[PDB]
Amino acid sequence: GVHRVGYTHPSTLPVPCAQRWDLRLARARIFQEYIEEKAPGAWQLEDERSMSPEFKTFTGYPMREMRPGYGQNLPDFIMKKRLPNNTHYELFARRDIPNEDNAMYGKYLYDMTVHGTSLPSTYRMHKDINKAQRNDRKLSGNRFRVLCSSGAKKPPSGWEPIPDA
């Protein structure tokens, strides 16, 4: 029924006793519990599928809030929300790069340590071997695309390239 939440002091009764809302206040003080005051009394729903063992999925803990007006938009949600700092999103981030060796070290450093030189990719050395051979049997199909052209359009003081045949 529409009942006014009343709470009489431990002084009015002709026997004092610690009253339960004051105990609620002491507990929301000790463990920093937000007391949501718009909490209506008619909505003490429990998740039967999770709280009631007459379903295949009895969990015992209310695995969710039976509350349709829910979303991350709410501050009461944002309060009790685990943040993605140090979560699987980070682990995936810091180990899921297309090449895995580039997550254990730097490729040039590993190369200059175990070999001497810093080696290309398998794909690059494919391109370079094909260059080595398709410019062995034939020529005049290439192009000259560079990052910087100033040194090609402008060779050094010497370096007069050879005309082939």
């Binding site: 700092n85 981030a93 810091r94 790069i97 580039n102 997550a103 254990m104 070290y105 730097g106 040039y108 030189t117 810093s118 080696l119 290309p120 690059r124 050395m125 370079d128 192009r143 000259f144 695309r145 560079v146 990052l147 910087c148 052209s149 100033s150 040194g151 090609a152 359009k153």
Partner: protein, 338 residues
């Protein structure tokens, strides 16, 4: 003959060096010896390579906001840039300024090590945003144009090696390298005591001297640079009456070996010894006499030794505690050093 994207570049070392350097060759990369990276770009071309290379928060994009071009052709339809002055009539400008991207140093751990909020991640180590000069993270002019090219760009030339370095970054990366890239002992042999920490250090020493321990500790929670030794003197001094051996030992250890051994001073050790007395701790008296004895590393390398008169005062306090506490064996040990 050649279709090339970059016309011209720039040398990293200058001719007061190169003209003597060139006479030995460089053992270059076998498969592509000439390496026209990002450092060699011009200023303007690299401003292009820095403007672009982000999704909507690199100004290279026509509708990114900090974009330079006024015209953009959308499939043979021209759109022109509505400037800020036309725009503010319906998008009222709120621009706090360059201080609104730099979080306080007390929110680094909450923001996962960072202080900036830029699109471009700001590593605090040198070797990551290093363009030609090592990238210094100046938190006072962090723009969206980003002139200093210190940002950990997303889609720039030579970005892959640095993105890999960023993902292989350490556990404590921003904090450790940000600490050490600043705040180092000056060749005068002195500890880095600064200007902006002096008033906060006054707050701490006054509160702790008054005995407001947790108040001084909440303020110490704001010690960004190093405190002078007296701040630890007071923050340990406050503990004496209540016998807070635990809080006191932790106040000692925070400068001891963590902050260039500021806390290794005879009077701070004396305060912490007093706390060991009032907490009745035979093992903490000996721990404090142990830090007093020191070892070679502190006593010589970091040169945080204690004046012999203070050594003696602390030793007499140890003996006065112990032979008053009947701890004959350990008192005899300290007198052995005497």
């Amino acid at each position: 003959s050649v279709t090339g994207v970059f016309s011209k570049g720039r040398g990293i070392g200058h001719a007061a060096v190169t003209s003597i350097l060139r006479y030995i060759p460089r053992a270059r990369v076998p498969w592509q010896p000439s390496r026209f990276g990002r450092e060699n770009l011009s200023a303007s071309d690299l401003a292009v390579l820095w403007s672009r290379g982000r999704y909507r928060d690199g100004p290279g994009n026509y509708n990114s906001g900090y974009h330079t071009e006024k015209t953009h052709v959308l499939e043979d339809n021209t759109v022109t840039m509505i400037p800020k002055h036309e725009l503010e009539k319906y998008m009222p400008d709120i621009s706090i300024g360059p201080k609104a991207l730099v979080t306080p140093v007390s929110l680094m751990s909450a923001r996962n090590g960072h202080r900036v909020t830029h699109d471009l991640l700001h590593s605090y180590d040198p070797h990551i945003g290093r363009l030609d000069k090592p990238a210094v993270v100046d938190h006072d002019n962090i723009t969206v144009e980003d002139p200093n090219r210190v940002g950990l760009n997303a889609a720039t030339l030579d970005c892959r090696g640095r993105i890999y370095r960023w993902l292989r970054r350490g556990p404590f990366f921003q904090e450790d390298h940000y600490f050490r890239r600043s705040l180092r002992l000056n060749r005068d042999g002195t500890v880095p005591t600064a200007a902006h920490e002096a008033p906060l250090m006054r707050k701490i020493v006054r509160l702790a001297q008054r005995g407001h321990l947790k108040a001084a500790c909440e303020e110490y929670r704001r010690v960004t640079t190093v405190p002078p030794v007296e701040v630890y003197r007071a923050l340990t001094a406050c503990c004496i009456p209540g016998g807070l051996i635990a809080d006191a030992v932790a106040i000692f250890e925070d400068g001891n070996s963590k902050l260039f051994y500021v806390a290794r001073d005879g009077e701070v050790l004396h305060n912490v010894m007093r706390c060991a007395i009032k907490a009745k701790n035979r093992v903490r008296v000996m721990w404090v006499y142990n830090v007093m004895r020191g070892r070679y590393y502190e006593n010589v390398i970091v040169r945080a030794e204690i004046d012999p008169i203070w050594r003696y005062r602390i030793a007499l306090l140890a003996l006065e505690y112990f032979l008053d506490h009947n701890c004959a064996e350990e008192a005899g040990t300290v007198y052995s050093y005497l």
